[PDB]
Amino acid sequence: MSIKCALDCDPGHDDLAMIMLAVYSPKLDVQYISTTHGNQTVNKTYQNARRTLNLIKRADKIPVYRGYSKPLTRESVACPEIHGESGLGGVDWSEIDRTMPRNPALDILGYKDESELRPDDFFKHLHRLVSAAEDKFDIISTGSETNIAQYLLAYPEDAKKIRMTTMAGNFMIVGNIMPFAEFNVLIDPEAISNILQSGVDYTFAAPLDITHTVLVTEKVINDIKAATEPYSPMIIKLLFFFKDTYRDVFGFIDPPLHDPVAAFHLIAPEWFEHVRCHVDIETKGEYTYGCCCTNLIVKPDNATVCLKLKEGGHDAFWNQMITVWGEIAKE
Amino acid sequence: SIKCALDCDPGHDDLAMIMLAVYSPKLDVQYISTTHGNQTVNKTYQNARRTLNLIKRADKIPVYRGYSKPLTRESVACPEIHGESGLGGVDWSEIDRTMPRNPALDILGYKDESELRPDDFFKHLHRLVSAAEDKFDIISTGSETNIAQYLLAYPEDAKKIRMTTMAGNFMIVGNIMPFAEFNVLIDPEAISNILQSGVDYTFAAPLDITHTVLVTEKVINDIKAATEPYSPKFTEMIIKLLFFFKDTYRDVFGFIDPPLHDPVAAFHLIAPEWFEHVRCHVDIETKGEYTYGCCCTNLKPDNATVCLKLKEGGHDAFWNQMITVWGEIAKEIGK
Amino acid sequence: MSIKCALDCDPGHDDLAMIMLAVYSPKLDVQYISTTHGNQTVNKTYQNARRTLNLIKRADKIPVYRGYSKPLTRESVACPEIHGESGLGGVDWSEIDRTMPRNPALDILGYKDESELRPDDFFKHLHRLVSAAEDKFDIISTGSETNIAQYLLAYPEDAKKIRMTTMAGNFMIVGNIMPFAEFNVLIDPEAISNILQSGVDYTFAAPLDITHTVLVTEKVINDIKAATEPYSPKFTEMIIKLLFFFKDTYRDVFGFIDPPLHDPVAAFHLIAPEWFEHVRCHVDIETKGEYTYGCCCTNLILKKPDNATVCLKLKEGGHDAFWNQMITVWGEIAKEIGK
Amino acid sequence: SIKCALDCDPGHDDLAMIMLAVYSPKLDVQYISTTHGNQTVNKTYQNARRTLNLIKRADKIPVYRGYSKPLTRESVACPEIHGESGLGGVDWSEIDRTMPRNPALDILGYKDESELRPDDFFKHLHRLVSAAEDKFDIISTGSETNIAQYLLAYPEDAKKIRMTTMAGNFMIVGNIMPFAEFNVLIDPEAISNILQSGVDYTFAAPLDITHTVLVTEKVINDIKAATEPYSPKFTEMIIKLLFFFKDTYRDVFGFIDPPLHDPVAAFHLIAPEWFEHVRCHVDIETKGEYTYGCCCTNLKPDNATVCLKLKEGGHDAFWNQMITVWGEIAKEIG
Ligand SMILES: [Ca+2]
Ligand SMILES: [Ca+2]
Ligand SMILES: [Ca+2]
Ligand SMILES: [Ca+2]
């Protein structure tokens, strides 16, 4: 029993880790990747998704769609201070690029080349998956949720058959890029607000509440080397670029690894605390847009929030993650 | 002859506008996309097709069914002007039963209408925009959700699009809300996106103009004069449609004679010489609790043309154009 | 029966006309004038109120208070493009200033001099009037409504005993200084919003809907001369130059041929309400809009509890009744000023 | 000795703060103004007077009754932390019966309390502000409506006022709303006006600090040690007051030991050396639907000082100061 899903993301060094976990995890069957604006322009995140796939020798298997370039009703805002100009700083990609297979999505779409990629391309693919699902189709979202909101404006009747597992928000701690809000929400608050009203089964699987406790320590670096060096002398430099920037910008000693925890939730939900509640997304605030405001501490519930991993959860997460990195090294 | 597309929410005004645009020799209608507004987008789709079939063009013009709701707000129907169907006042059962297949299904390679999707029109419009020598012309007389959706998908096309709209109020107050007009206030974010996109945008027919363009009794008799001799049934249909539209406008707004809004937009593309025009910066209120959709002007760089008035002669030129088309349709429908 | 009232205003050429009508009307008994920010700084509108009174030989009778210098939660915004730098352009005030009596308000307050004037001075005065009223005490407001809002934050229990007659807003036509809103509301929308929630009996007596139809035409000019020239040629010169300064600016900025005279219509409503159409309704004041703050939004195009009366039109006859009242007062002032 | 005024909404914390400020030798309290918040301003007035009478000062310190509602919003009481009276946990009937006349009535020339008006304190404060060598010190631990009202009346006095406040949350989340603290969110426009006015404004005691300042068991025993030998009844009263405050904080927010918020503000004026401090630009959310009153910082010109933490030693210094005052009050009550 393996779970069909799609990934929506903005790679992004976290997003790269998340793609590795999701694609190589036996529990998941990734149907496609759609990229979004966020960290970088959606053209760069598209490229970075493909690079990730090619590195792990899957760029010829998984279709990658290039989604929307800006939020519904706001201006784009890149995050180059964590991720670099390319969106995946710290490595030379020139080889990975030159040896890059054709994107399977072009075949699904019947396109000659990438210049024909359009933001809504993924719609028909996802609609087939949603139709085929016995209960609900699973999306893992770890960037802005513009793409999914765009989709549900086009296919509103599909909302009730979609389950979203997201890295988004902050509830019991403060924000990152703004005082009380998290990057993914605040770049398109209207998107998430639309989704939470749509009838989607929505889980905040990995808010900052969890992910700020999931740090790439030196012990984690040595366990990666232990699992990968014997098979394949990139991943380290990538997590180190991500380390230098998080120290530079936020004064974290060890950087949090956000997005994979979302994928981990779909793989292994038993390791997560969960509560149902009503989440309001601030869209009107001048300085607080994207705040995730909850009734927990009487509007109906519209979401599940995971505030903490059960003890054991951190180790379960790293075990899962080191294993996948091991398998990729073998290949 | 000017290639264009129509975006609309029929709607009795929108029906009049489709007739003018399709039969005007100056225009070449490439497609019709329908939007939410007056009614659900499924009803406005149906009503667009009905209009086309009545005027014997439902087999020529492709009709797309666009988005069912605004970008970030709830839908709000206008059944108190237009009825439950969106085109009250007539029995459509014949026009429906004798309805040709929609040419859009052929372009799209679809078996049937149940496969129509809101973004279907995108690729069609992109080809038109690419082919245009200067800019491609869209006439918009409903919510501008569809065009905003399009420009989120094809942002680089904005600079090659020219929009001619029935929207807004500038120097007079609103209709459905105190200071705002229906088409803007149902999706203010849409129009706001458009005005920021680089589109060449013209407020061709705000309430400022259209409230002076009334279906009087004189207008009704000139319609009969131009149509009865060729097609009594068409006369019956068009008159009952404008009368339903009359009763409701009296009921809801206390107008003696109802304004005919949407055709004026098409008239602008046909015959711009009859319109006053000024360039300015338009801000759309999106934050106001009671004033969202207000068109606020500096009368900040210019982002729009506003037409505040017809030149003297303009009203007669408009009605002549409109009566002529109704005459031509009567000839085709026959006796 | 003569009606006790207070004036709140920002003179301002209209406000000057309104003070003349109110002070000399036999139907009204003006207890005080409080000035507010708006047209000019509140210190200038204070001065201009006093000047008006001194011109009409009443600066020693009517106390003038100097109210709040800025809105509750927004920045001040002067209107010098209609009114000039002084707030009362078009005449030389240097004589009227030199011969200026002590302000009776200083006596009520027990103040040595004007340097002690404070925005909330008028509060205790108004509270006594409100307490003494049999039904409600009448305020005529023709500037920002900051002062009254400030008062009701201090004396909230007095709201139910206050009746306000205002020159404010636009309902069935568009605005002046912003597309859909009128100056007096948009300079302090929160103030009016507080008032409409407070329990005050509030009347929009003179929106732009009415006042844009109340123009200083040539016929009006000749009737002023007829009523004033025989008694006081200089007063004729002064009042005309004042309405002419107001004419040049309104033509310059808004392309009016003949300028509207706004604020006196509010006072006229208290004098003679029979000349006004009136309807009760719910008015929402836009406070959140970026470009539309101060809009007066109602149900009134179409066919929440009522919180206001709106006067959309004068009854036919109303314009002439207004000018008769106004020219009579200008006549009486001419008699008193003399040659 | 530092001349100051207290603005507050007692409130159990506010009561503790009044005790510290009035009995601290470093401070000279000129007056107390009460505000809406925890309870109606009439109740917080009463509670301020009660506090003063308990500590035998109700005949010395004038108490003004300020504004009953925010500038542009509806009042919102906090009876779930503080009770119906605003000072639950004890019987005040004796303290009330034996209550001296309010010195403010004498300053104002008023027959009785029914004549108290929200703006009464204005002229008093203006004299203090004028007399100050540099700036006059206000300690604010409720809504800041009164001070905002004052600065609308006396805008030129802003540059001569220094405010030390218990307000806000910066690096942690809020209490009564997800990302905002009670005192700010009940009148965000007030604080926003103040930060634009030219006031020297210090967030001396945000939740960042006060959530680390808990009434533990050790603190309870030090209170008994300092007070029981002089005044058993005062011991009973102060303990029941902190216990009422304990039960409610556990009930509502699941705190083991309740934070004591407002005195930390007064402590800052007494002893600023124990506080970390940084200058920054604070924006107050006024437009947000669910986030009004958020203190958003650039951590635009600086408009405030923020104290994010006590220096190590600071907690003990605070409690020493606080236990000492409670000791001295016990001596006087007997
Ligand atoms: Ca990401
Ligand atoms: Ca329409
Ligand atoms: Ca005025
Ligand atoms: Ca307090």
Coordinates of C-alpha atoms in Angstrom, one line a residue, chain C residues 46 139 203 339:
Chain C
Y46 CA -10.1 80.5 16.4
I139 CA -25.0 71.8 18.1
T203 CA -28.8 65.2 11.0
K339 CA -21.3 104.0 7.6

